[PDB]
Every structure is written in C-alpha cells, then in structure tokens.
C-alpha cells in the first residue's frame, strides 16, 4: 500500500418511524416473534469460540412479561474469566499489526449491518429484552450504535493525522500505539448502544478487549456479538463474558496486564472498581486507564416566558421515555406559577393516560421496569414519597409487579424547592423567583448530568446558562435534557466528575493510545562542544 | 466586543549562543553579577503579597560554590497554605470571568517580556541556583517557557474552536469551562520551564492555582512571579509557597475544593500525592484531575552503520549534559563492537577532558550536582560501581564536595547487556547481535522515557523503530534522546504510563477543562406521542 487514505464520511443515521404501513414495522414483527418464540442459549463468546460455562444458569425474560423466557447464560466462573483474558492476550499480536484501515473496515462494516439487514433484529431484541419501545430501541440499539461506529472510525483518522512540526535539519512524526495490556469493558443495562461501544472504541485503536455485558441486555449483547463476528470481527479481539461479572473481576482487576477499565453504570460499581483497582496498583505493568460514566438526574426549569405546550411534552418525554430508566431522566421541575396555571392539568391528565404495557404491542409509549429490583426500589420511592410531609403524588404511584415490572408514571407537587424509574417531582415557584430558584439549583446540585430551561424571554435563557454553568453537564434550551445524539451533543458528566474523555468524541479514542514522538535528525552534531564554551 | 479573533501564530523562539564578543554574552554578564552579588529574602507570595513567613529559614546557594548564598526562603507553614487556597479561591471568579483573550495576553506578554527585558535575568538566575551552564540555562529558562506560553496560547485557542455539529431545528455548541476548585502546582529542580508552565497551563483556561517550587529553583521561580506580575498577571490566581511542601500538602490534599494537582518529579514524590488523594477521595467537591510526569533513563542503541562521530556526541551530550540531570538522562548506550573500535577511545578521552566548574566561568561544559542529597547518591553510585564484578570504571569516578558538589563524568564498561547524575554506562555488543540486543532493551526496559539509535542503515533504523515500539516512550534517530522541543517532540512519558495529557500539546489544556454541550432547539415537539403510536 502507498498511500493516504481518507476514511468515508460519518453523518448521523436517520432514525425510522415505524408508522402503521411501514415496511420496517412488518420486519420488525416478524424478528419480534422469531426472538419471542425461540429462546436461546446465550454463551460466552472466548477467543471465538461460543460455549456455555459450568457457573450457574440464569434466565434473561421479557421485564413486561416475566414468565416468556429469552434465552439462559451462564454466570461466568473464575476458569471463563481467566480464558478470555488468555485469548484477548492471544489475539492482540495480529490485531495490532492489521493496518488502521484493516481495523477500521471491520466497524464500517458492523455499521452498515446494523443499518441494513441486522436493524430490525437488534432493534427487536432490545425492544424484548430491556423493555424499549421501538422508538427507545431505535435510537439507542439502531442509530446511536451506528452513528458511534462510524464517528469513532472518523474520529480515529482524525487523531492520526494530529502530527508535530519538523525543524530545519529533522522530520518529526507521531505514532499513535494501542495500550499494552487488555482492556475490560462493563456496559449497562438501559443502552445497546453504550454496550457496544465500549469494547469497540479500544478495539479500533489496536487494543483487545473482554467484555461483561449486562444480563438484562445480554440477548441484544450475544446478537452485537454475532454481528461483530459477520463484519469480520477476528475471534479473541473481544471475548464476550456473561452473568454478574464478580468472578470476572477477581481474575482481571488481579492480572498485572490490564491497562484499563471502560465502563458504564451506577457510582457504587464504579467506586468497587476504582479502590480495587488503587489497591493493586503495585502490581500491573502499566497504569490502567480508567474511563467511566455513572449516573445522575436531571433538571428542567421554566421561566414565566415558557411555551406551555412545550413544556408539558418535555415533562411527559424527558420524565417517562423508557421508564425514566436512560442515564439521566428528568426527575426534578421547577415550574413559574403562571405556566403552571397553564399547562399543570393537562400535564397531569396526560400522564394519568400514558400507556405502559407489552412492547410489542406498538401502541404503548412504553414498558416495564428492567427487573424486581428496579421495581422495588420504585415501589419503596413510591412509599417515601406518599410518607414524605413535603410531597403529594398527584398523579400515578400505581404498580403491579404479577404480568410485567410495571410502575405507573408517577408525579409529585413539592411544596419545597435514589432509584431509576417514572417519577417527576414537581415545585411551582412564584413567577419573581426565577433568580432565587436558579440559586437552589446551583447550591443544591451534585448529581445532574444535564438541565434545561424553558423560556422564550432571551435574558432569561443567557442568565439560566450563566448562573447554572457549573449545576449541571450539559445544558439544554426549549427542550427536554435527555437524548444525546453522536456529533452533535458531547460530554454531558455529572458535576465535578472527570468526563471530558467519555463516549463521542476523539478525547474517549485517545484514552486508549499512547501516543510516541519519532525524531530523526538528518546531520546530527559530531562535536560536543557548544559555541558559548569557545575562548 | 463584538469578533471571533484569532491568537498571534506561535514559533519557536530563537536559542542565542552567547558567543564570545556577542552583546548577550554581555548582557548575561551584567545579570550574573547583580544576582551572585545581592543576595535576596525568597518570600512566599500570596494573593499578590510578597511575605516572609515563619517557617525555618532555609538558604539557596550556588551548586558550584556552595558557600555563595543567593537568597533564603521560609518553609511555609500550615497558616500560609491555608492562605494560599484562600486567596486563590478569592481570585478565581474575576480571572474565570476575563475573556479568553485578556487571560491569553498575559501570558503573551510574559513571553515577550522573557524574550526581550527579562532574558538573561531569567537565564541568570537559573544558571547560578540550579548549576547550569549558559546553554542549559537558554534552551529550559528562556526558550522552552517562552514557547509552553505561546504555544498554549495557540492550544487553547485551537481547543475553543472544536465544536460540533448542528442538526435541523437546533445550535449545539460547547463551552470549555474551567474547574471547579483551586490547582496544585508542584514543580521539580531541573527546568526553570516546567516550573513556569505547570502552575500557567491551568491557570490560562480560568483556574487559580497554589505552586510549589523545588527549594533548590526558588531563586528563578520568585523571578518567574515577578515576570508574571509585570505581565499583568491578577493577585491570587497564582500564589507561590515556598520551601519543602509538606505543610503544603497536609493543607491542600485535605481541603475538599481541591480541583487538581499537577505534578513532575520523582516516583517516589508522585506516588506519596496519588494514594493520599485516594485515600482522601470521599472529601473532594470534585474528583481532583492528577496529572503528573515522573522519571526514567535513557538509552542508545548503535548499529554497526553507526556513524561514530554522531555516536559519540550523543553520548557525550546525552549523558553529561547539565551533570546528567534532566527528565532522563543517557545511562545505557548498547554499541556495536566494529563501531566501538572507532569511536571508544576519543569518547573516554573527551569524558575526561569535559569541564565542570563554575558556570560564572562560560568555558566550562557545565556545573555541579543540585545539592548534597544528590551528590551522596552520585557517590553511592559510583562505589557501588567499583565494587561489582560486572562493571569496570573506565573514566571518571571522581567526586569532591568541598567548594561545590561536583562529580565528575563518568563512564562504566559493562561486560553484561537509581541516581541522577553523569554515569554512563556502556555495554559492547558483537555487530551480528543487533537483533538479540534490541530483544535485551526490550525485555528489561520499563523506565526508559526515550530511547536512540545511530544507524545509516535503513533496515537497521525501521528494525529498531518497530521492536522497541513499545520499550520507550519517546524515539529518536540519529541524534540523543534528550531536549524535546516544545511543537516538535510532544509525549515521551515512561512505560506504561499514562501521559499522553502532559505538558506540550492542547491535551494538557484539556484537563484543566470541563466540557460542556449546549443544545438550542428552534420549535420543539408540543406533543409527547410518537409516530409508531398511531393506529
Ligand atoms: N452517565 C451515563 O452516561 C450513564 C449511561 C447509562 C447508565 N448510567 C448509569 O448506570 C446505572 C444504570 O445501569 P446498571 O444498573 O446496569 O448499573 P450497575 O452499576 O448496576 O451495573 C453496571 C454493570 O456492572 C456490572 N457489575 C456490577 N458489579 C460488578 C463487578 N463487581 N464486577 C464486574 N461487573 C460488575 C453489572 O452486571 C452491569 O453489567 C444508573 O445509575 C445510570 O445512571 C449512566
Ligand atoms: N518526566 C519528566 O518530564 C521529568 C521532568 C523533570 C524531572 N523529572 C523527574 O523528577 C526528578 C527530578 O526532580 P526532583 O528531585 O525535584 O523530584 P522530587 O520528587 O524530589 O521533588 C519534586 C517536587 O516535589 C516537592 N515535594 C516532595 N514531596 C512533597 C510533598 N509531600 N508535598 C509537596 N511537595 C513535595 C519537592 O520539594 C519538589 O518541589 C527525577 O526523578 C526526574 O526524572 C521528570
């Protein structure tokens, strides 16, 4: 090869409605009643080799139809665990020496599987397994996946070509290694998309990887797997290990090879793995590059110059889309009186009519919860809050865990300005109190990762993101705060957290690279003696 | 203000030679004298206020002539950290709110003032604390920190620009917000530059920070502040505390506004601040960003198309260089024999005759040890040297402290393939035994910061390039493996390491950064209800 390619140009991929007589709504039911009808079993994916494991049988269900089975895993053991970290080990030497466009190909082309013959199925079976909408599972499973496929390659080539100056008499270049050492990816349940980017961003860079879906998502994961594997995906560049992931992490957290942790999820795992990892530092060969996202909620807050209509329908989706089970859902309002006025009993009517039921059935805005310990904790929110002086559930607070996991959405009127799930607190301030709120906020935030405001009033909106600057991630106007989309709204942590590498930008790519200067001095001194030192 | 304004365009400034009968040579002359002769208090300064504190006093001397005092210093107590966090917490919110362009021009204009009025000042006063000869003291002192202002300037600016993509409907932009909390500047002996530019980096992107200077550069740090003041430098953004650091420490790891520490040193030192941070990591407003450099030794391989002259300039250079004393020094050359019998004789030779004195005297190649610990240590060295069966001292070896604490250059033979000091050791390798030798470096290297070899051939070179890919940070081809020059060789940290965000790219900047998306939409939904809802 001679020569300097360019890699195809990434743009966002369009997102399909799935509208009564759409030919992708007659795709999507026949995969639904493929995936429905014919559990599988769901393997451990090791150096390509798809087996089964001796640790304990678990089942992955339907949350909005417990009782219908998608397939069983089995939970990792110490012996699979130590087998993937052997043949990420293994498949590194020629993963590496295969040219960036080599590597590159092999996520294009998952792209454009993904976006083609695979959509519907991946779509499906996030839509079955982790209780999304097809509009949730489109987003996520579809399109994010896809758009994080072809952005990373694009983001990937545009590293490369980051280079240095040269100075008269040198040429100066910069190579871009992968990292010595696996990395080990740990992916939520609520996102298909997050879990597969995970273990693919490092891959690309020359990396290989082990990755710990979770169970809940592992019928979406085996299927990402598969699709992987049809791109060209060479085996034991990423082993797929299921179950709880413990037995996992007392082999690779205790391996002096691993050079990082890539991982999503709540701040108590995150936390595990971080003083584990602190407290081995002594033993691996190289600092371990520890990249990672945990949660927080979200703020919406409506100034009096706030379109009413708009407010209610950011209320309805930022609160209610999937459950309130995204990264962040809104989960606190601070609404002007007068829009209150306007707006508070249709938001209430509104979501006393939302419909939670089975997926499959197009009609419902959405499902259930992920499983019976999402829904307990939405059950004992639901008890403190109907306990709790300073709140009101005004609408909602109803759930049945006997068919599905399923929590009614739910809204509480505080007089006074955790879990995952449909709950949105609401406080109604007097219309002059619009600065004073925006203080509560800032004083009172540690845990939004994004915050809105809604307001038509231009002063309004400059003073909401100036004084908020620091209370929130990223900040959104005259919409809801949730749906980050790929190239367009980066970072997003919560406060104080160290997030600008996360997931959508070059800055996640160059985590897992180390980057070498080359110099090469064409006629180098042949003496060592330097003019100042000349009588 | 109404512009989107471009920086000056940075390059790198000019080296002068000091050459006998130049006007800087002069010049320099002028400043040695002023400084050697009027010896000064070193105070702490704080929120702008120049203070002595009540601390020990502790002296700073000349290296050379350790009986020539060139200023003394108090150890900053408790009370005085307590008021350098304080006063940097008091300066943050005026300096986070100057535009861009008004914290960038002073930081250019303190450029400006060290290429022009302050130059051999600056260099002066590094050369008489730190032992540096002339040259040292021009290419750390002057050039490198005037080009890591520049040049960061110009980083900064490139970083505010990467923005991104705007769908239909909407404006999405980011905002580079600085930390929340103060920095933690702790600089080592060895580069009046680093010095400059670990406490400047961050404070460029609207942080106020606390620095503490390597008691042994004091003299050109107090300058470094007063340069900054005439800059325009505001009161408190950067506060200086002198002396030792413990007390330094036990304040500002323990205060909960802690942002940051930014780091180069020892192992040992870096270490000590990384488990204290986490132990402490529940305290912390924010998770603080660590970012630090620490050591290693340098090698050089020859290949039989060695050229021996360069080799032996390489060696001279890269080993004896200011004693030896930089981030990493050559300690290991691996030279072909056929090019040995060139070229190992006229290297012992020049070893031997290479001066060391006075750097007053700009004859000399250079100076002394920093100070008495690291003359023990040379000492400690060197007799361990003379003791082992596997190393004979072939030039050099001696050692006086009794004027100043020099140690001569010294180079061991080593019949078999830590200090900082001018020790070179030197293994002979059979020509045929290239490839069995880079497998040695290989294997046994895990603190080399960058490595070379000396080759015509260009087989040799590619060979070397690729099996030490990963046994060296930084590479260099036909010249030594020390000097990175600000624009040109970014990188080079050890192996395993983590330091692709160290100070010389727009990387650096970043982590003193928080990110943040701003997402505007135009006409928002005002219906929740999604299109494959509909019946
Ligand atoms: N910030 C973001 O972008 C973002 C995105 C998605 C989810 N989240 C957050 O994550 C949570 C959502 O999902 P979750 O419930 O799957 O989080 P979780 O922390 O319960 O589980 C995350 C993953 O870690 C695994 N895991 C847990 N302990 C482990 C161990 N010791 N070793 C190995 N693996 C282990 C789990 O099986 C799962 O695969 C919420 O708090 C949410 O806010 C955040
Ligand atoms: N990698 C690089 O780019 C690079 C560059 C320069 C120096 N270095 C390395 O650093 C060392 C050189 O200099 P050094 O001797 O000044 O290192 P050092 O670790 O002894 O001291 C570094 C700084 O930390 C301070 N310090 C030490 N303990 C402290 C504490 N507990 N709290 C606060 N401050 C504390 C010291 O006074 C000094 O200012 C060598 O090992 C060298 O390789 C590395």
């Known amino acids: 090869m001679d020569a300097i390619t360019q890699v195809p140009v990434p743009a966002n991929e369009p997102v399909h409605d799935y509208a009564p007589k759409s030919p992708e709504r007659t795709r999507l039911r026949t995969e639904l009643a ?6 599988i079993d769901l393997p451990h994916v090791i150096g390509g080799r798809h087996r089964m494991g001796d640790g304990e049988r678990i089942d992955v269900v339907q949350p909005h139809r417990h009782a219908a089975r998608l397939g069983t895993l089995t939970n990792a053991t110490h012996a699979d665990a130590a087998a993937a970290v052997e043949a990420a080990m293994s498949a590194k030497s020629d993963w590496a020496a295969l040219p960036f466009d080599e590597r590159a190909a092999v996520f294009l082309r998952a792209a454009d599987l993904l976006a083609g013959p695979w959509r519907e199925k991946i779509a499906a079976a996030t839509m079955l397994g982790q209780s999304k909408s097809v509009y949730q599972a489109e987003i996520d499973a579809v399109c994010e996946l896809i758009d994080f496929w072809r952005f990373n390659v694009a983001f990937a080539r545009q590293i490369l070509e980051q280079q240095p100056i040269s ?27 997050i879990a597969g980017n995970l273990p693919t961003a490092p891959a690309l860079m020359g990396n290989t990887v082990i990755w710990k879906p979770s169970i809940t998502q592992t019928l979406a994961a085996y299927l990402t797997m598969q699709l992987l594997e049809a791109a060209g995906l060479p085996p034991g560049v990423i082993n797929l290990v299921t179950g709880d992931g413990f037995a996992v992490s007392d082999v690779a957290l205790a391996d002096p090879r691993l050079a990082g942790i890539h991982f999503t999820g709540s701040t108590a795992t995150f936390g ?12 691996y060969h190289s600092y371990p590059r520890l990249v990672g996202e945990t949660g927080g909620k979200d703020f919406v807050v409506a100034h009096a110059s706030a379109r009413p209509d708009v407010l209610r329908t950011a209320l309805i989706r930022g609160a209610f889309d999937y459950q309130g089970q995204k990264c962040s859902a809104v989960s606190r309002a601070f609404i002007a009186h007068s829009v209150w006025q306007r707006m508070g009993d249709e938001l209430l009517a509104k979501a006393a009519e939302l419909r939670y039921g089975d997926i499959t059935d197009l009609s419902n805005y959405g499902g259930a919860l992920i499983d019976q310990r999402a829904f307990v904790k939405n059950v004992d929110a639901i008890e403190r809050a109907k306990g709790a002086a300073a709140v009101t559930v005004a609408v ?9 996991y399923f929590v009614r959405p739910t809204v509480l009127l505080s007089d006074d300005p955790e879990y995952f799930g449909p709950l949105l607190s609401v406080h109604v301030y007097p219309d002059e109190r619009y600065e004073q709120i925006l203080d509560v906020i800032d004083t009172g935030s540690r845990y939004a990762l994004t915050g809105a405001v809604i307001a038509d009033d231009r002063q309004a909106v ?16 005259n919409d809801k705060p949730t749906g980050a989309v790929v190239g367009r709204q980066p970072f997003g942590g919560a406060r104080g957290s160290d997030t600008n590498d996360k997931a959508g930008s070059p ?28 009588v």
Chains 1, 2 share one sequence.
């Open 507 to 534: 800055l996640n790519l160059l985590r897992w690279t180390s980057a070498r200067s080359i110099k090469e001095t064409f006629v180098a001194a042949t003496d060592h003696i330097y003019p100042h030192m000349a």
């Open 272 to 283: 595990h793995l971080w003083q584990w990892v602190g407290t081995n530092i002594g033993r």
């Open 396 to 404: 909602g607070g109803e759930y049945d865990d006997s068919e599905g």
């Open 167 to 193: 100075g008269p008499g040198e040429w100066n270049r910069i190579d871009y290694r992968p990292l010595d050492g696996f990395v080990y990816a740990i992916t939520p349940f609520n996102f298909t998309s």
């Open 462 to 477: 400059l003073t909401a993101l100036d004084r908020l600057r620091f209370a929130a991630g990223n900040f959104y106007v």
């Open 34 to 39: 493929s995936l429905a009808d014919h559990p």
